[PDB]
Paper text:
The hydrophobic residue L86 also adopts a similar conformation to L265 of Env. The electron density maps revealed that the side chains of the grafted residues were well positioned relative to the computational model. As a control experiment, we also immunized five rabbits with a synthetic peptide of the CONE 4 sequence (LAEEEI). None of these rabbits could induce antisera of significant titers, in contrast to the [name]-immunized rabbits, indicating that for a linear epitope, constraining it in the right conformation with suitable protein scaffolds is favorable for the generation of functional antibodies. Most of the animals immunized with [name] also generated antibodies that bound to the deglycosylated SOSIP Env protein, whereas no such antibodies were detected in animals immunized with C5S3.
As the sole target of neutralizing antibodies, the virion surface protein Env encodes a glycan shield to restrict the antibody access to antigenically conserved sites. Small protein mimics of the CONEs are designed by epitope transplantation and used as immunogens to focus the antibody response. Here we focus our protein design efforts on four CONEs, including the structural elements of β sheet 12/13/22 (CONE 1), α2 helix (CONE 2), loop C (CONE 4), and loop E (CONE 5).
Author numbering: 4 to 99
Write the structure that this text describes.
């Protein structure tokens, strides 16, 4: 479609200390997405994605299967997937 969606994500495995945040931001920006990425307090990576639905879906697949080159992804959990009519962000940020 040419609709917009928002979705929350959390990635499990060898996902911290592998340049995951930098690569996620770069891929998000390449895909024209806004949102954020952050290392959690439980050894995972999380955030939200917003943008054109096909681009969000491409990013979801990237988060399931690839991530940063030295990452090892066991699972990507997605939640709160929804259609949106406006963006809630103006950039794709790494949240410290």
């Amino acid at each position: 479609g040419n609709t917009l969606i928002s979705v929350d994500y959390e990635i499990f495995g060898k996902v911290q200390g592998v340049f995951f945040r930098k690569h996620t931001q770069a891929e998000g920006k390449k895909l024209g997405l806004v949102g954020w990425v952050q290392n959690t307090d439980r050894g995972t990576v999380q955030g939200q994605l917003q943008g054109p639905i096909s681009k969000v879906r491409h990013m979801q697949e990237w988060l399931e299967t690839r991530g940063s080159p030295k990452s090892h992804i066991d699972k990507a959990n997605f939640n709160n997937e929804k259609l949106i009519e406006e963006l809630d962000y103006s950039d794709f940020q790494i949240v410290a």
